[PDB]
Symmetry: C3
Subunit: 432 residues, 3 copies
Amino acid sequence: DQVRRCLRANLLVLLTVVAVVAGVALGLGVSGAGGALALGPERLSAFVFPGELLLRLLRMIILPLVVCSLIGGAASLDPGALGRLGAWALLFFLVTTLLASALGVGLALALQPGAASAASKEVLDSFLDLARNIFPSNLVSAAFRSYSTTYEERNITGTRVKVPVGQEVEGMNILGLVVFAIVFGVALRKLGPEGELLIRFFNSFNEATMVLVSWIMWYAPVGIMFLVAGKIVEMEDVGLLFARLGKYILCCLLGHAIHGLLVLPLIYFLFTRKNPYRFLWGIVTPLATAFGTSSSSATLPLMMKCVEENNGVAKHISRFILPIGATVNMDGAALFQCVAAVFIAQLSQQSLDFVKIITILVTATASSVGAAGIPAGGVLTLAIILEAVNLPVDHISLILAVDWLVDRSCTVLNVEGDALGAGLLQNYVDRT
Amino acid sequence: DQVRRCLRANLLVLLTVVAVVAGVALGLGVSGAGGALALGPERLSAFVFPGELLLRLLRMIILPLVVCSLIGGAASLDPGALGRLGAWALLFFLVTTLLASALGVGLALALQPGAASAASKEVLDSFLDLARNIFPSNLVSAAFRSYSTTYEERNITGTRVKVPVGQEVEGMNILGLVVFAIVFGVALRKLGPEGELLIRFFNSFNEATMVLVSWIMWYAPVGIMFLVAGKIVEMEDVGLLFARLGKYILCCLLGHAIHGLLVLPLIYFLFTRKNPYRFLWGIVTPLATAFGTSSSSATLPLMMKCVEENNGVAKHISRFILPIGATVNMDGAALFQCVAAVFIAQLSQQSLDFVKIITILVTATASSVGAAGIPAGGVLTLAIILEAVNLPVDHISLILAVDWLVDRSCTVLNVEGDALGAGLLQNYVDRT
Amino acid sequence: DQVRRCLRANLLVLLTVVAVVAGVALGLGVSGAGGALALGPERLSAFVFPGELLLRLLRMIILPLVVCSLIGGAASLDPGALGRLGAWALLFFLVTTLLASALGVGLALALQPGAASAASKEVLDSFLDLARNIFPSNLVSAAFRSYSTTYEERNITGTRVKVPVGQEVEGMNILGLVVFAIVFGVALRKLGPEGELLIRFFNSFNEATMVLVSWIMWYAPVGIMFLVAGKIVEMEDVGLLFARLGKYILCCLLGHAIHGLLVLPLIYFLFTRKNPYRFLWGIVTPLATAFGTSSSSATLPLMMKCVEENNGVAKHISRFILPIGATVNMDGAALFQCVAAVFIAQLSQQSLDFVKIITILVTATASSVGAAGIPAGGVLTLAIILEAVNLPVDHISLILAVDWLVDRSCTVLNVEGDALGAGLLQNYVDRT
Ligand SMILES: NC(=O)CC[C@H](N)C(=O)O
Ligand SMILES: NC(=O)CC[C@H](N)C(=O)O
Ligand SMILES: NC(=O)CC[C@H](N)C(=O)O
């Protein structure tokens, strides 16, 4: 009857949380067998192994996906700078996403989820190391290794000269590779119709790897349950992690509720001079079903069906920015990246490092225009920024473990983002 | 007269055995000058050098050839799962090639050619190291280096903890790269007509490198004679190597004669319930000329000219599987890879290592559908598996030195393979 | 009036010498503040840093530009071996460029500019190391690292055995990569119309990177002034460098005047048996304006407007070789590469090493057919050979600092090259 309708539509996002609550069970079973009742680090890695094989070939495809889905994207941008009264919305989308992700980290590293009872050093003139990494030395070595400065001593006229020498270290720099792929993407657009084939090569190449990143997602529930099992063994506690998680769902949703209800409505009232609470009261029902379906793509047509008569928006802007803002202005993911990538930074206690805090915030504004629409789409697109800023990505497991609630909490602020942007632009254009 | 006909048609396979019997001559000449009558390892490498330059740029082209001849191959496979009574032949071709290569190694490492008078250690849970190498971490580092586990000691609560740490070591993993290229090859087929260009890119790219691997083969006779000369110098013996070779031609041909005359005719009689010796007695003459021309491509049309009336095969299956089985069901090469790559393993005494024995047997079943048709075509395609399972490939020289007999011995079992498969399928379809 | 005409046409080659004379000014300002009045090597590198960022992403684009502008070049060569009386001009262009670059180094390392008051070791059987580097082991490791032999000791029957072992060291080998790209370029031409797309891919790919190497050149004047400032600090002298430069402009222009006035006119009189000084006296005015505009592309149409009636050249060869020789026979750059890359070799005192002196001379004959037409075009194309023969490329700064005179001195010998080749071919064809 309806056991074929709902169960087969969102099977995978259902099955991926079936996996982790069963993955923790045999994780509890071996800690019910008790710690390393199985043999030590030479044999236990063989039983955490097919959890690595989700994570290992996940890093394989992000070399095509981050560089070939982005050239074909950035070649089809700027359609003649299409809106004199349209590009201000695109500038609105960027500043409401920076300000989204500004309090993203700025709440979490102020609130410290992860380092509660947990309780070499790098100079902040490693900003040039970030800039030397943006523009890579050559491309083929930039697909697997990246630049980094280590300090050695000279011991000449002073026992501590502390000279920075730069040795290229492993792990790719997709942070320094999407900057190539953007600046290659404008290049072959500017060249024009003679090099159209290179677009038609590349934007078919990502759909040749988006079609196999679907195949990786079907491996994920078998894969996830072996890196949540082999993640609670070496931690040995279960009461500890549900306080590790149990503060993280707080700072996400509080990070949404602070953002969603106040700070973009303050952006509303500073330009609209009307009531945002009279504004969104008409559009509660798409924001109701966006929490239900967890898809701004699915609630895309229902927005114009409601906001056009429940609020006085124009005709042509209902289809002009709101199809854009459903897959471009994604403030909901931009919190969810920005508060997770600093959360995993507090799991392993990497570094405070303000130079990383901007590049954990620029990329989180750049994956925010990335994955979209489908539920649990941000899990892939924050898996590329955890490889960008060299975090240990293997802690993705516990933070898509609770994705079933938090992505539904971010989908509603996602769909809210262009909606208030729609009402803000109509008062800028009808006022004339 | 006929000095232009025969001599110019198979010139290269003639000239490559002219080269090695002349290459051993000045190899005997410097050992007739006596050992290192020339200067030592700093000067003798300069005179073995243009033998390395066959072998060095041989490894260059196997990065395009193994990954671009295989996507364009695997995109044109499964034409709608073309045969309800046809795909059983393709399943027949695989199981008669595994069972071919099963006794491939299983004869040779039971018979030990190479380690007769010759007379760190790795754990057999390096199977995960093989599986961690199948699915690579990223593609660009998978074109030149591969994963491997080394054991270091921890010396904490036990002086021998033996922790496996994994450092990526040099030498590419085409074993882990053709698995990408297959699973990319099904990807852009499944995507359909929108990404047809990526096929039309790639299957023109291999013909842009198959046309220069012809040019490498013309360098080979100049090249071979300087790595058979500089291979018998450091071994210093000539009576030793002709016992090294003189057992290898045995186990190949015995490996064919055990396979060809008994074990697939036992596959015949278990399904046909007729006489295979009454079967192949009609088709001795193509099997006669297949030994002569050493080309299943050349003896491809002569098979239907004989087997269709000398035996009661059907009309449509004479052109349905037998054109397939001439370049797909190649059991003759699949012995010849599988008994050489363990033979070279016994020259350098690498390792017994059952984990390698399956991946010396999976790939030998995968290059068996690879190179075809032309004589001495398996020499290239076993040069890619000697780089797969990290054998020293420079001992290819002495085993194409005697290729002139053994490939003619494997061509006849090659052409035999689909022929008995043709007779087996007709008794499965005419019986109805 | 004319402040918009001249100033906006050659702005960049004006602005790049504005930059260096202002870049030396604050370079003099910090040495007017006196040496390391700023903090030491941990802080001064942060203020030489945006000079590195010209040089760093300069090395980025020379992986596409040297391999994708060269396949699309070498696929469109040999149009049916187009001239029975035309290819002798192309053979003339090569031998007048070797003989140009023969005295290129051969003047400079005989005259020693750079090592005047400046006042491990590698064996000359590192020629095989050059040949082992021409033909690379695999392509993807040839885009960032290259082969090199180091000698270790064996200490067995002699305390100094000096065995050469070969470890691959950093820095790419575009010397060994353009040899692939040529021999790939003939491959897909020979394959014909079926692989036309790979040409149409690649010759659109360089115009997708020639269009961003324009964007690098606009960064260059901001970029240059921070690596001439941070180059005179560690040298601390200003009177020293203007003797370092002040001999270099000598050996260039003397290298042109020896070449231009005598040695190709001796090639003239050995075949023409007429007066070259009666020859070029008619064409002083294009050679006048070639010094002025510093562009053989701009003085391309003015050559046929003068040399066709001021000298008795034919009709059809005026448009047959002289459009070729304006962008192929470039002897002016071939001095300017060949005397700079040995000049920078005498700045850092790298090595005398006759094996390098031919590969500093083969590539300088190969970039001579490279960049063209525009003034200061050789600065890019000698930046790729300084990465070829592993020179420190960061001394490009002081030798485009004085490019404004020397390229105008080489443009006139550039345009002279095919002009005398035009007069030489007409006396070979009208004589019949
Ligand atoms: N990561 C997310 O959940 C993004 C928000 C919403 N689900 C979307 O796909 O647009
Ligand atoms: N390597 C081989 O000789 C293969 C068998 C046969 N010569 C063929 O080309 O099909
Ligand atoms: N590097 C150079 O100046 C080359 C000579 C001349 N300017 C040209 O572009 O052809």
